[PDB]
Design a protein around this ligand. Structure first.
Ligand SMILES: [Mg+2]
Ligand SMILES: [Mg+2]
Ligand SMILES: [Mg+2]
Ligand SMILES: [Mg+2]
Lengths: 245, 246
């Protein structure tokens, strides 16, 4: 998919977004000032929809549910944020939100739609012996439009990598039965450079240098648990962009 | 400074390091199998010295102090690490340590020296109202060979950036009186894009979702306190590389 949907009645915001996405990403764009303009829009044509909560024919966020139910991933455009609003949106299945209170916050949308577009073709692997942790991380990576493989043990991870050599990034949990995180990182790096297979080591900063041990064994990066979805997206995106650049 | 010193008696390891550093960095390399061989090397010519603890004439790590006192920054080459071993080193003046138990672990030194070379010409700013955290972060960054400016509050940060436009990366503490970290980030971003001035937001990871707040305000990155030096080095390196390549 090569097209971005924007539904936003502010002439200024809509134009800022079209100009920026057009110039920086070269992606196709449909932009409407009403939910009614976006009526023909189906999920299979758009990477993602950037959706205002203040539309003339949907003044209280109604466009969000409407577009989610047509199969469009949605990123909410918002002037305000709160803990309650964040939780509500994320519960309804919204991918993310973008602050539109300033031009620099609005710029977040531009890097995001470019990232989401590139992610569509990218295979990643989560390796974690905690089902709860594994499923949370997978869900969150799936909301980045990545194709996400799952493994509950290093043995499974190694087997999945052999079967799917398109996987380009692996997130690695530190403590697992038989073969722990650092040990799996050593095994992978005995075969693959940081440019062939990016590795993010999942750590805790309440240990005696787990992140350090990851890096000295050739992990591209670290991420400490517990982590927010916004932290995950930031860290994954960077490492994916390192691979492309 | 564009030269590197290597003092390592393993033929295999020294040659691996020479090959990789010659191939992947623009650095000149002087390598020796004994400390005596490196006698006349002067501190002002070398970016860093990669230093074995097991040398024929310094079998218990004596070469580290010797080269430190010649004004060379030192990265230790070690076959095995403990928490007790990184203990005595960093409190002596070591830049970092590199594991030499495998080819892939050696490769960390390659990336490191390349980055240490590049960091010499790069200016950064630490903004933090806590004296100890501000001083430690400054010390750690200085160990990455960066040129490091400090600010105790947003007002001083801004004045510093005005006086030193070469600064390309700011690390911003969240809790500061009068003007907080997110407010400073907002002011900086009204003028400068993520490509013009990199911003790493430092916070504690709790219920306020501060990391998220930084990112949505245009911070390039986040780092949660408390953090280890390798964590800061990793983060700063990634952001500097982003400015150079993305
Ligand atoms: Mg509106
Ligand atoms: Mg585990
Ligand atoms: Mg030796
Ligand atoms: Mg503070």
């Amino acid at each position: 998919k090569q097209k971005i949907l924007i539904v936003e009645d502010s002439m200024t915001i809509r134009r800022m977004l079209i100009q920026a996405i057009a110039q920086q990403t070269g992606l196709e764009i449909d932009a409407f000032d009403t939910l009614e303009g976006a009526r023909h829009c189906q999920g299979d044509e758009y990477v993602v929809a950037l959706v205002d909560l203040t539309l003339p024919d949907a003044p209280s966020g109604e466009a969000v549910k409407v577009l989610l139910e047509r199969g469009l991933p949605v990123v909410i455009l918002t002037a305000d944020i709160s803990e309650d609003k964040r939780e509500a949106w994320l519960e309804a299945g919204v991918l993310d939100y973008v602050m539109k209170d300033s031009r620099h916050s609005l710029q977040y949308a531009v890097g995001l739609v470019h990232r989401l577009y590139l992610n569509q073709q990218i295979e990643v692997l989560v390796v974690d012996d905690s089902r709860t942790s594994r499923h949370r991380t997978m869900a969150q990576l799936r909301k980045q439009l990545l194709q996400v493989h799952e493994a509950s043990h290093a043995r499974e991870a190694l087997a999945t990598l052999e079967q799917h050599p398109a996987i380009r990034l692996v997130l690695v949990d530190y403590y697992m039965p038989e073969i722990d995180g650092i040990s799996l990182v050593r095994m992978l790096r005995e075969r693959y450079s940081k440019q062939q297979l990016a590795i993010i080591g999942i750590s805790v900063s309440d240990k005696r240098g787990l992140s350090a041990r990851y890096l000295k064994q050739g992990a591209n990066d670290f991420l400490n648990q517990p982590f927010e979805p916004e932290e995950l997206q930031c860290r994954v995106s960077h490492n994916l962009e390192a691979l492309e650049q």
